[PDB]
Amino acid sequence: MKEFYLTVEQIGDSIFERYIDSNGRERTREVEYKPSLFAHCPESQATKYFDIYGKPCTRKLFANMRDASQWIKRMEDIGLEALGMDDFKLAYLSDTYNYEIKYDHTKIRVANFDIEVTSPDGFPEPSQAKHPIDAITHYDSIDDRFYVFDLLNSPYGNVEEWSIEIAAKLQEQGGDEVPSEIIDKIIYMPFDNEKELLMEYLNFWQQKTPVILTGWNVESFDIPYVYNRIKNIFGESTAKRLSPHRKTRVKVIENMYGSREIITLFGISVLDYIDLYKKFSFTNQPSYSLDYISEFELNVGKLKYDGPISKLRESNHQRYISYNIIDVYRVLQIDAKRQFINLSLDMGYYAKIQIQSVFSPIKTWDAIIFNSLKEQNKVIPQGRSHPVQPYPGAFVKEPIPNRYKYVMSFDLTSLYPSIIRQVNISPETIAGTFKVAPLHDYINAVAERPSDVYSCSPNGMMYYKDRDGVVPTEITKVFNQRKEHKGYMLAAQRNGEIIKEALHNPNLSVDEPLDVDYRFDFSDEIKEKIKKLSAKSLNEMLFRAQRTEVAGMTAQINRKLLINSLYGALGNVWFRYYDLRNATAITTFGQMALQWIERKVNEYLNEVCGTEGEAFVLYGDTDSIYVSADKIIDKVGESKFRDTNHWVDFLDKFARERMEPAIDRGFREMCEYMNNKQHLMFMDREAIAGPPLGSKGIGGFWTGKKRYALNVWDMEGTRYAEPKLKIMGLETQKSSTPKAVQKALKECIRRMLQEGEESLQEYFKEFEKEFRQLNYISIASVSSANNIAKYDVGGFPGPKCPFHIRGILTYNRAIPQVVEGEKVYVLPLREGNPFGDKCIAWPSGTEITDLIKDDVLHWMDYTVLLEKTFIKPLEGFTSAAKLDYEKKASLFDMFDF
Ligand SMILES: Nc1nc2c(ncn2[C@@H]2O[C@H](CO)[C@@H](O)[C@H]2O)c(=O)[nH]1
Ligand SMILES: [K+]
Ligand SMILES: [K+]
């Protein structure tokens, strides 16, 4: 079989590679790679190698990688360009795997692990590793087993062994409810001292060395801590055994507050799952803790345990070990439905890069373009340094703060990559420049046509229309590949149905599943044989068809991500193909496109509605516009509609049959104005929002850029039974917003948009009345404790001290401990309180210690709390929407109705 690599590393003059050989067995080899680079040569020198500009090149084959590195330096000193792939790992992978890689993930050892550490304060510093590791949960994908290393004796407490029988029992039976499916997959190993624990873990590691090392927050805590702990206890040499090549690299990261440590283990690809999640998930959750993402993805309640998390081992060691196991399973569950690990492998093998490079758009695209050009004997340009110069970003319209009853949004398809293809922007397609007028002149089409022969962008750049272009050609390839895999996905879908229709009274005769390609529709002859297969064979065929569907899904999602990350690479000064002029040409064209279409839509709606100078477009952000449909609805007459679904259908039709054609018309004109290579500005209806028919709801409101709320009924063709609240930038989900207030503010917004001012006013009165009976933890706000010592002057706040830091200081005077950088709950205190200040703070996720809890709660300033956390932000919403959360005085007040 075709072999595939696992990991690759460069150590001196050799490439250390772990891979799956022809016999499907994992192996390691050291290769004295002889790299090739290129230098320009005279036309006289005949060759097949040319750079992207068409200039001839000659190949230089080196004896070793060190010589190639020196040569580059020598060329640079002189001033000559040194072309070719300077990252020898990519060159090696490109030469060694000169074919489309077909990998088998079941042979790739993926470890998902977790390291637990008890400490008096509860947030031990990884770079120090001053405390013992008292629990290690290591799930191995090949063995499909959870290895649990449990420390029984510790200076922080001696405990008894974990009970695998108690773990399964339900909550009421005093159990932990460890899923029945994984109970038999647990290998529990108790230890009396940390040294034996760690040494056995280290041996275990040498036998089942991870290829892919993952888990939640593994890069910032687990890895650094175990590496440093082993280093402190057994010495650096022992710690280096965590790397199959005994080579390690410790990088220190600087930040506003402190320094972090990141350990690179040669021979291992670390993919912290929290980062993998943040990169591939198409959302932006207000929190990325395992509990939050678990509830969101798996819809399961966060683990429950009384008391602080740093006290869980001492207070309930049984639940401590059971939960560590469950948390790892949780990550595994999240990967089961999101498939991010596999997505990483798919993307990695596609680009032919180290798997961990998926976190780097420039690295990924560099390899893709490199391998693609190599097939045409084209040589890549040497990377050149560029200063970080800020250039125009996306266009975001300043909205008029107000309520907007009916809104309809439209958006462009893959904007930036489409612009690249439309204008044909690439380093080698630059054809010149033209005298540029102000941007508003192109938007209004008052400026003279830039060029009659070249494709233009509003920033003053011109490109050839006749030439393909490396960047645009590569985008197109990926786009065509996405459709191809989409086709396989659908084919494996129709084939799956043919197999299911057969599972209805299948023949009993014994047979085997057919050897067919599920990516293509079944031929006639295949469908006839399928009519005679037994259930056993059909079920096996269904399993394979689905396996094919998923692979198709992963492949097309991979391509989508590649396309969406390209612009980021092109705007990165470290990208080989970066060009400030091209980055600017893309963004300014984007800005022109949105404002040009905003003018077109306004002109069209004023005409159609017989109005004048009316502003229909109320907001726009990057690739979408929001249109007020109030006038459109009035034109028809609201009493003319039967129900909500009626006006929604009307706007859907109006958008599709009227506005869209006008928009397409507007964009084709812009394309001719800029004389672009091809029209790709495709904008169509996205959402339709408004209040339910016959209600007094306001539908939606904007407070400013990126701050608004909409009551959505339809999203690109899919009609919702229950409207969905689209809320953005109103901080109703922000971690600093108290729990009860997050729910209250949302309810306030739902009522405003769906029921009206009156309903809002009754809920406001209701929440305010109930506020003082809610649990104190649910109404406290949350802040991060940064720079505590800075304002710590003899125990009291120095000048310019933050409100929450002041709280932390009064807490310290009063007395869990507050750890630098960590989060804390904050509560204001009434004047005359015994704590000596206007507020107090304590560790988040915990109750206030008993010695002061009741005093604190008795001095809590509920009024100030309510005003600051609830009323202030609500007032922001209502002022923008022109409403009162409190009924204004009326002449009818003095009456008793
Ligand atoms: N065509 C091409 N080959 C390259 C480049 N950089 C390195 N090579 C090497 O050229 C050789 C094969 O044609 C291999 O050893 C490649 O790794 C580049 O930009 N283009
Ligand atoms: K964790
Ligand atoms: K836990």
From Swiss-Prot:
For the site Essential for viral replication, which positions are given?
714
Give the result of residue 415 to G/F, as annotated: Increased misinsertion, increased mismatch extension and inefficient proofreading
Q: Which Gene3D superfamilies match?
A: 1.20.1280.300, DNA Polymerase, chain B, domain 1, DnaQ-like 3'-5' exonuclease, Helix hairpin bin, Palm domain of DNA polymerase, Ribonuclease H-like superfamily/Ribonuclease H
Show the segment(s) annotated as Polymerase: 380-897
Q: Annotated region Beta hairpin: where? A: 248-264
Impact noted for substituting residue 567 to A: Inserts both dCMP and dAMP opposite 8-oxoG rapidly and with equal efficiency. 100-fold increase of dAMP and dGMP when situated opposite guanidinohydantoin. Increased incorporation efficiency of correct dNMPs
Q: What results from changing residue 565 to G?
A: Increased incorporation efficiency of correct dNMPs
Q: List the disulfide bonds.
A: none
Sites binding Mg(2+) 3 sit at 411, 623
Q: How does it assemble?
A: Part of the replicase complex that includes the DNA polymerase, the polymerase clamp, the clamp loader complex, the single-stranded DNA binding protein, and the primase/helicase. Interacts with the polymerase clamp; this interaction constitutes the polymerase holoenzyme.
**What is the recorded name of this protein?**
DNA-directed DNA polymerase
Look up and give the organism this protein is from. Escherichia phage RB69 (Bacteriophage RB69)
Q: Which gene encodes it?
A: 43
